[PDB]
Design a protein around this ligand. Sequence first.
Ligand SMILES: O=P(O)(O)OC[C@H]1O[C@@H](O[C@H]2[C@H](O)[C@@H](O)[C@H](O)O[C@@H]2CO)[C@H](O)[C@@H](O)[C@@H]1O
Ligand SMILES: O=P(O)(O)OC[C@H]1O[C@@H](O)[C@H](O)[C@@H](O)[C@@H]1O
Lengths: 462, 462
Amino acid sequence: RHLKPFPPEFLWGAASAAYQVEGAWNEDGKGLSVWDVFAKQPGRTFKGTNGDVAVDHYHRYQEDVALMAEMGLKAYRFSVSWSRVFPDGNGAVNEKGLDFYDRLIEELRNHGIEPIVTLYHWDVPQALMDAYGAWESRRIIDDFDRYAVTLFQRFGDRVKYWVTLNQQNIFISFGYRLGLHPPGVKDMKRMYEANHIANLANAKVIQSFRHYVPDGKIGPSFAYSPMYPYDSRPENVLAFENAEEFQNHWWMDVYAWGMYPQAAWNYLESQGLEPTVAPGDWELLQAAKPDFMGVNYYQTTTVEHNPPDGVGTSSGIPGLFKTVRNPHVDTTNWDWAIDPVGLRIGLRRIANRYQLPILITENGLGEFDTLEPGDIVNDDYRIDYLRRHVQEIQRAITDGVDVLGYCAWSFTDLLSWLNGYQKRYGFVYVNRDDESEKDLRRIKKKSFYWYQRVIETNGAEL
Amino acid sequence: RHLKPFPPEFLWGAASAAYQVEGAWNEDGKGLSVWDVFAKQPGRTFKGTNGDVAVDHYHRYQEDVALMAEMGLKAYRFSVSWSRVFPDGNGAVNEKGLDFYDRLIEELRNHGIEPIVTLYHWDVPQALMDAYGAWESRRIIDDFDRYAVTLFQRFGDRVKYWVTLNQQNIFISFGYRLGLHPPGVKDMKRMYEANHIANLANAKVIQSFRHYVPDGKIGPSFAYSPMYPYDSRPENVLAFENAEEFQNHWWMDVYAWGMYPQAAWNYLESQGLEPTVAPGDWELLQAAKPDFMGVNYYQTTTVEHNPPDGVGTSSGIPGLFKTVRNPHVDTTNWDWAIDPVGLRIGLRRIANRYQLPILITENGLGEFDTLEPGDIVNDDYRIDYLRRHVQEIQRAITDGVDVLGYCAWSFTDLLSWLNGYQKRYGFVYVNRDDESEKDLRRIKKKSFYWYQRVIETNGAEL
Ligand SMILES: O=P(O)(O)OC[C@H]1O[C@@H](O[C@H]2[C@H](O)[C@@H](O)[C@H](O)O[C@@H]2CO)[C@H](O)[C@@H](O)[C@@H]1O
Ligand SMILES: O=P(O)(O)OC[C@H]1O[C@@H](O)[C@H](O)[C@@H](O)[C@@H]1O
């Protein structure tokens, strides 16, 4: 079987998120985000780590882009911090905030790197939470649209690729069901209402994008764990049907088709959990087709039958499914599956169901890297993980999936939302830890040079 | 979770096919079908059994309909023999042939039974095979359309529910890949060409139906074996992705969306097997949406990884998948799997992928039946099989699938295409065998009274 090459304009990328890298949390007129406030609540984050400084990319962006150019990155995906642009979410635009992203975009373009702008990575301005509960109010649809249009107007001439909501399923479920992320709520009814409003906000911004960036490409990015049945027991295959629909189609069908899947809807309706639908909602959701599906991928999930008095280790929904360890894949040191074939499966499923091109917006390995004498980081484990995923992407392309690019997570080490700094993801080590910022110096890991060679050969040497 | 009831207008049905029941193979001007000719080839059918007489429904239809009314059937699904209506396939209409179906439809309507007319059950007139190779020629599109339009014009005022091609995947694959059915060809290239022509014929007649029967409901019926992965090994899940797309989406995506799935298309193209596409084909296929998906269901299929030098007992496609026995399902005395949950899974998959209502056009158990003195046939095994499938349909309805009805296969015993009469499917035993027509008398089996009670309670008592 001859494999197809990676296409000539394949976006070999790397990625970050604003709160995780920028720092400068109160500089240049930036307003408070919900994460600025949440992470300072005692006990919320490991060792009290927060984004006040992070890795200081706000001040060190020129050095970081110089490293990207040394690597030969074709694309860099970053998020814009809404609270830098509209400190209060709505109201007056902050020109100094826009100017940072203008300088970053110019730095990228001057080095031949395609910017991929992510509108939203979980950091809605605290003022919108204070005023109306942020994602629980339809008011956010127009406020988010005004913010997005501002970015489209300022940067649409120079940015072709845009991501709207990044991992909506995570920020909504962690914020409103698990209570782990802002606003720290544990209420499924509120979760599904906020989720519906986020769906409308995504659709509204895509419609606006067609007016302001007619030659651009836009899509949401979904945190996709493809589901597997444990085996060929009919009840386990049925559990897989339930899980793939409830965990995955629930989001991606809205993004692609503007419709929630019916079995999941009817289940929520039987629990009194389905969202409130207003006139015009379906019309808007259906009339906002994206150019691609963004995919954040780390692992698959295997499921089995879960009786109605069952699991609510394993997690699941009684009567629908429960998770079970997959005996046929390796695991990371944090019990995450390592399943590169699962990435090919997920790509195939998206092409098969929606016929959409895919931008892989995030994939990477987190591990406790050691800085050895001479400023050397031997992260062969990260090379092995990335190599295997890139190989499976090439097989998915050969199968016929249109993959637009691959953004490794992450370019530099960064702050995790709740777990501090020690589990590192970067190609570039940042010298700091949970106790202090040290000197924040950037140190290329072995994986940096491996990926440099991948890009130079367009994937022929992995 | 309590099960939902069956909807009040649920079509409790039973079904047959013209060649399998009618007889009267050369009466009232009927022309030869491809099956009249094929079954008379020596050695082709068990003990030389053929459709010359079958169970003589052509002459005994009044008694058979009287039995349906005694059972309280809500619907009877039958096929129309094209060669009775157009003995030469095209050319002159045969009024005596139409008159049989008119008399049958009047008998059904006089007893309050909904006719479900199936346009095609494998019996294209031999004259069209001789003239141009039947399904291998685009000429059949207009000839099939003129036949269908004739039926719509004569019967559309009295028939709401119509099935177009019944089990296209079977008549095409058995006729052109396995050589088991007419025309006895074993050539994948020819199979995919004939299949594409059948797709166009289906779409053309649905378009005609929208004009002639504006209040009717129409759809194709697909012989659906839902695929399962053997286990959660990523390569086996990938084999399942390949198999479901190649075996199932290849047909149902064309019916629902007018498009072949891309990974399967690209594989066939790499083998030189993809069909020839003419201008206008995609437009026609996309503009012929059905009201429902018909489903003929007997069993699921489990698959596993198949290396490129592998199977092509097990069957499959090297590099894509191969079948494997599922250790987690029962079997009939003929080694067909018994998997009622698989029916729920298939119904869920069709709703989840296509949002279509489903008419279950065929499901039943074939087994030897013993005629006991006093005209008693105790077929508790058939009751058990049907009960378990109906129970799973009720669960699919509860999940949110719109199931329009359920046609048990079959109403009376009938002639098998290749295997004679001994493996019986009816609610009504027919006293004949492979060697003799005996007296052709109809004898109600125990399952007849069971289904009568199902219908009386609208499925509440199973
Ligand atoms: O008497 P048999 O051979 O058991 O035939 C029963 C009915 O078979 C249905 O089609 C089956 C077919 O027999 C299988 O070979 C194939 O794999 O499955 C299809 C699935 O529907 C026919 O629909 C019916 O006309 C026969 O009575
Ligand atoms: O450090 P952790 O907890 O493994 O988190 C890693 C990543 O988890 C992903 O879900 C998020 O998209 C990233 O923002 C985050 O960096």
